[PDB]
């Protein structure tokens, strides 16, 4: 019996149902853009469960016993079985609002509000937005437009590893005992990503040393002429608060200049702009941060839902709290968090939910 929770399923990059999941992912994305959170969630859960299957769906009988497959989702599956296409997903791909929202939000610094504003002003292309003399852009959007082609090109593993070298080199200059771990999609085994994420922690650094590292590292890169964009969010983390966007570790959203000579791959300007996110956490919370920043987004949503609805526990990126025992549960590894929750350990490459 397949569980309704992604944290109780093994989801590897071996997807046998991409014909169904690509359609469900488009319908979920459109519902996100149309601010229909409920319908978005239903399509995301259905797409997630199909991604976990060890076989391709070839008839409606194959869907019997599979959870998170409502009547609307089953109608979409039935239509794809019929002629290999989703008429619903095809209509979304051709919708002018969907196309504009995908195109505008593909710019670093442009969210739902700005995309909607530009669409209602009558804009349909990035060329017409960029050349407009009345529009005002944020510093994030300026960088988003200036390095657009590099940021819309996917980051591959040789590039991610070249970025890892730069991060490690900079960090150990100021904190030589620091541990730097690549998180996100690349930690789950992905060949490509939109950015490169890292978790930084130090077993001996003080509260102030921990605070100053991201400032020292980014100033070093600014001096080297490698810092193309930088936004540092100070920590809002509270050591003794109970475990959605307001509480967080110190982090920074960057754009780094990656020289081609640093990339060791089999293969213009001689450099590429790369989106990099750095997260600094206290040493004792490193397992919770690692689990949260490894993802996938759906795996994280189901982990938190399972903890709350099944084990009356409260989980987030900073801690695990037991509401029955009225105590915070400690962990030195992800394995210990899974054991506290009563879950079999799911490897990072099996969290592609
Ligand atoms: N406020 C935030 C930001 C990020 N994350 C985590 C969970 C995600 O898996 C990942 C989200 O940022 P990304 O979209 O870069 O993660 P990926 O590396 O998985 O995305 P992609 O492969 O699409 O580049 O890190 C989080 O928990 N909370
Ligand atoms: Zn990423
Ligand atoms: Zn990121
Ligand atoms: Zn928290
Ligand atoms: Zn080489």
Swiss-Prot record:
| Cofactors that this protein relies on | Mg(2+)
Top-level taxon of the source organism: Eukaryota
Listed GO MF terms: DNA binding; DNA nucleotidylexotransferase activity; DNA-directed DNA polymerase activity; hydrolase activity; metal ion binding
Q: Tell me a GO biological process for this protein.
A: response to ATP
Q: Where does a 2'-deoxyribonucleoside 5'-triphosphate bind?
A: 185-190, 194-197, 292-293
Q: What EC designation does it have?
A: 2.7.7.31, 3.1.11.-
Tissue and organ distribution: Isoform TDT-L: Expressed in the thymus, and, at lower levels, in the bone marrow. Detected in both cycling and noncycling pro-B and pre-B cells (at protein level). Isoform TDT-S: Expressed in both cycling and noncycling pro-B, but not pre-B, cells (at protein level). Not detected in mature peripheral or germinal center B cells.
Q: Which UniProt keywords apply?
A: Cytoplasm, Hydrolase, Magnesium, Metal-binding, Nucleotidyltransferase, Nucleus, Phosphoprotein, Terminal addition, Transferase
Q: Where is this region: Mediates interaction with DNTTIP2?
A: 3-353
* GO cellular component: a single term: nuclear matrix
Name the positions where Mg(2+) binds.
Answer: 195, 197, 277
Which residue intervals make up region (Involved in DNA binding)? 110-114
- Phenotypic consequence of residue 251 to A: Nearly abolishes enzyme activity
Note on how the cofactor is bound: Can also utilize other divalent cations, such as Mn(2+) and Co(2+) (in vitro).
- Catalytic reaction equation(s): DNA(n) + a 2'-deoxyribonucleoside 5'-triphosphate = DNA(n+1) + diphosphate
UniProt similarity note = Belongs to the DNA polymerase type-X family.
Subunit structure and binding partners: Interacts with PRP19 and DNTTIP1. Forms a ternary complex with DNTTIP2 and core histone. Released from this complex by PCNA. Interacts with TRERF1.
| The protein's name | DNA nucleotidylexotransferase
Q: What organism does the record attribute this protein to?
A: Mus musculus (Mouse)
């Amino acid at each position: 019996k397949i569980s309704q929770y992604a944290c109780q399923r093994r989801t590897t990059l071996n997807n046998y149902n991409q014909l169904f999941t690509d359609a469900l992912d488009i319908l979920a994305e459109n519902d996100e853009l149309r601010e229909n959170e409920g319908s978005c969630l239903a399509f995301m859960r259905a797409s997630s469960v199909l991604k976990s299957l060890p076989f391709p769906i070839t008839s409606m009988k194959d869907t019997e016993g599979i959870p998170c497959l409502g009547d609307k989702v089953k109608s979409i599956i039935e239509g794809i079985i019929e002629d290999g296409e989703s008429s619903e997903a095809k209509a979304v791909l051709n919708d002018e609002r969907y196309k504009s929202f995908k195109l505008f939000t593909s710019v670093f610094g442009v969210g739902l509000k700005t995309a909607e504003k530009w669409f209602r002003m009558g804009f349909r292309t990035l060329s017409k937005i960029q050349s407009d003399k009345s529009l005002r852009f944020t510093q994030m959007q300026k960088a988003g437009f200036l390095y657009y082609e590099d940021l819309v090109s996917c980051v591959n593993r040789p590039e991610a590893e070249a970025v890892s070298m730069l991060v490690k080199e900079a960090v150990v200059t100021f904190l030589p005992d620091a541990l730097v771990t690549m998180t996100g999609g690349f930690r789950r085994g992905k060949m490509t990503g939109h950015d490169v994420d890292f978790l930084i922690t130090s077993p001996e650094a003080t509260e102030d040393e921990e605070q100053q590292l991201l400032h020292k590292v980014t100033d070093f890169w600014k001096q080297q002429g490698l810092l193309l964009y930088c936004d540092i969010l100070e920590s809002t983390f509270e050591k003794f608060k109970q475990p959605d966007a307001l509480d967080h570790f110190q982090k920074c959203f960057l754009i780094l200049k990656l020289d081609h000579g640093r990339v060791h791959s089999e293969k213009g300007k001689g450099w590429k702009a790369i989106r990099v996110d750095l997260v600094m956490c206290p040493y004792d919370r490193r397992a919770f941060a690692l689990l949260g920043w490894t993802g996938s987004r759906q795996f994280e949503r189901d982990l938190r839902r399972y903890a709350t609805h099944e084990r009356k526990m409260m989980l987030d990126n900073h801690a695990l709290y037991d509401r029955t025992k009225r105590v915070f549960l400690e962990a030195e590894s992800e394995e210990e968090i899974f054991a506290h929750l009563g879950l079999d350990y799911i490897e990072p490459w099996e969290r592609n939910a």
